Amino acid sequence: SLFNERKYLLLRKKLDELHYTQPLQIESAELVDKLLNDLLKTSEGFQKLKNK
Amino acid sequence: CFAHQILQNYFVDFPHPPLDLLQNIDEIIKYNDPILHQHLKQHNFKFV
Amino acid sequence: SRKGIVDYDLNIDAKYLVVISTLGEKYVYDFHQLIANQKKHQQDVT
Amino acid sequence: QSLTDQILSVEQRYKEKQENLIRSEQIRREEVIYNAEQKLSRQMKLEE
Amino acid sequence: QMQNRKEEIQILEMEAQAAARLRQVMELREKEDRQRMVRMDMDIHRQQ
Amino acid sequence: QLNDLEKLYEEKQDALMRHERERREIITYEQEMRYSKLVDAERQVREERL
Amino acid sequence: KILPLSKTSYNQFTNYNVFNVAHQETEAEAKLEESKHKIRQM
Amino acid sequence: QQMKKLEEESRKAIQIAENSRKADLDFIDQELQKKRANDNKFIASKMEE
Amino acid sequence: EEDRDNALIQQWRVEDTEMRLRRETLKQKKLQDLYKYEEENEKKLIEA
């Protein structure tokens, strides 16, 4: 599971980078990851739609 | 000379071996009596 | 949940259920104890 | 002609699983060897 | 069956478009994994 | 008819893993290389002893 | 069809992944200096 | 009209991905350059005197 | 001639397939170069 722990790092770090709080554990890290993974693409898809 | 005529595709990847040939060989044998592949596939044996 | 389940089976003595992870790990556990544990804890989560 | 190309996809797709096997072999042996080299570090305990 | 051909043809041609792109898609998905491996190998050079 | 529906999830998902991996490498390395350079910061106690 | 015959040149094996090649360790010093450490101790 | 827009979709299917992913590597390049710079500056400075 | 017209379904239907496949194999050539172009660009960034 080392390949997973090292993503939890990155996830928590990206959340702080983007100013999200996070008093929580690794379980659900993938939930949180998926939420950012799309947020950082849908927020864009939506702005791109607006622009067009 | 040998490397050029024979070993021309023995690197391909790296550190990884020439997977392309590990496959080419497996395509031979499949052709040349496929029963081995029925067994190799059945028990998860692979090219390489 | 990072190590999910590939398959499972129950001992006839239903108190123990064994589920096997996708990595081939057999999680052997008291099944009754586990239902009571997670049901009661998850009961107040909302 | 589509089948020829379908075949190329199968060939070229399946290769990935053997690349995975290759890295499995490649890492795992080097990982052991350079675990053996941790005794160079035990032989650094030497210096302690 | 001209109506059933009309429907079948659009079903098929649309898929053909998917195949038409997937051929390139596989190459770059392959690239990503092969390159991901390459990175790891240069990391080994750094470990040396 | 819908064979262009999937593909997008995989393009998305593969890019995500591509990025998670590159990020995984830099955070791990930035984190530990940082502790490594810190050890060097600790090595330059020794000028103090020098 | 390879038959790498040139009286003026020799061919590069142009399937060599330049990117993860040309870098084994040798470092005789890695261990002989422990001998030297003991010598210094001597 | 689809077949042409679909061919144009290679750009709408985003050759730009090459650019976005490249940018991600332009970034990883500089970030990795900073951590290696650290290793080198530090091993380099903690010496010699 | 109605029967000729029915034949014309299949005759033009396959030419549609023919021109489409001419492009499909031409993809295969172009996409192998697509792969290397991207792989090569990465390999050098890593090298520098």
Contacts of E48 in chain G (CB under 8 A): 23-25
Residue G23 and residue E41: Cβ atoms within 8 Å?
no
Q: How far apart are CA E25 and CA F13, in angstroms?
A: 13
- Tell whether E8 is within 8 A of chain I (Cβ): no
DSSP labels, chain A: -HHHHHHHHHHHHHHHHTT------STTHHHHHHHHHHHHHHHHHHHHHHH-
Contacts of C3 in chain A (CB under 8 A): 1
DSSP labels, I1-48: -HHHHHHHHHHHHHHHHHHHHHHHHHHHHHHHHHHHHHHHHHHHHHH-
Of the partner residues D2, D12, D23, the one whose CB lies closest to the CB of residue E37: D23
Nearest CA to A33 out of A4, A45, A44, A43 is that of: A4
- Tell whether F11 is within 8 A of chain E (Cβ): yes
Residue F24 and residue A13: Cβ atoms within 8 Å?
no
Residue B14 and residue G20: Cβ atoms within 8 Å?
yes
- Tell whether E15 is within 8 A of chain I (Cβ): no
Nearest CA to F26 out of D17, H2, A17, H29 is that of: H29
Nearest 10 degrees: CA dihedral of D4, D9, D15, D16?
180
Nearest CA to C30 out of C19, C15, C9, C18 is that of: C15
DSSP 8-state secondary structure symbol assigned to residue C28: E
Q: Which residues pair with C30 in a beta bridge?
A: C16
Contacts of I28 in chain E (CB under 8 A): 23
Residue E10 dihedral angles phi and psi, to the nearest 5°: -65, -30
Q: How far apart are CA E19 and CA D1, in angstroms?
A: 13
> Taking phi first (over 0 means left), then psi (-120 to 50 degrees means alpha), and beta for anything else, what does residue H9 get?
alpha
Q: Shortest Cα distance from I34 to chain D (angstroms)? A: 15
Look up residue A36 and give its two tokens: 């950012």
Residue I38 and residue H18: Cβ atoms within 8 Å?
yes
Burial of H42 (0-12, 13-18, 19+ CB in 10 A): buried
Q: What is the b/e burial string over I21-41, where b = at least 16 CB atoms within 10 angstroms of the residue's CB?
A: beebeebbeebeebbeebbee
Residue C3's alpha-carbon distances to A51, C22, C23, C24, C33, in angstroms, are 43, 7, 7, 10, 21
Look up residue E46 and give its two tokens: 């750094």
Which residues, including other chains, have CB under 8 Å from residue H25's CB and lie 6 or more apart? Answer: F22, I42, I45
Look up residue D13 and give its two tokens: 């797709």
- Count Cβ–Cβ pairs < 8 Å, chain E vs chain I: 38
Which residues, including other chains, have CB under 8 Å from residue D30's CB and lie 6 or more apart? Answer: E44
Cβ(C17)–Cβ(C29) below 8 Å: yes
Q: How far apart are CA E44 and CA E38, in angstroms?
A: 10
Q: How far apart are CA F48 and CA G40, in angstroms?
A: 24
Which residues, including other chains, have CB under 8 Å from residue D46's CB and lie 6 or more apart? Answer: G34
Indicate which technique resolved this structure: cryo-EM
